[PDB]
Ligand binder design. Structure first.
Ligand code: FES
Length: 105
């Protein structure tokens, strides 16, 4: 597909992806800040607080109440589309996706 990332360093990172790729991997491919490099998708960390644009959350489908709960346990605020991007992946359902990065969290 096609894609569009965002961040607080460039305020945008237009890109593209392929069914099976996450919005965290495109980044590094798009030269995006790639501000993560934590577990690499191993599913052992929870700091990859990425944010899908507010148009594709209903397209991407944030994480279930399992991965979203453990993260909410802390008590920090969250918006619509906040989910482990690294755990997300492209499909002919989320083509031309638009990503986003939260504030210093
Ligand atoms: S990068 Fe570790 S869970 Fe997303």
């Amino acid at each position: 597909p096609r894609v569009v990332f965002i961040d607080e360093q460039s305020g945008e990172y237009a890109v593209d992806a392929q069914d099976g790729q996450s919005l965290m991997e495109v980044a590094t491919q798009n030269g995006v800040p790639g501000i993560v490099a934590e577990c690499g998708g191993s599913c052992v960390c929870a700091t990859c607080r990425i944010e899908i644009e507010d148009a594709w959350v209903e397209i991407v489908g944030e994480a279930n109440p399992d991965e979203n709960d453990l993260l909410q346990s802390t008590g920090e605020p969250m918006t619509a589309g906040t989910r482990l991007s690294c755990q997300v992946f492209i499909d002919p359902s989320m083509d031309g996706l638009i990503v986003r990065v939260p504030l210093p969290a």
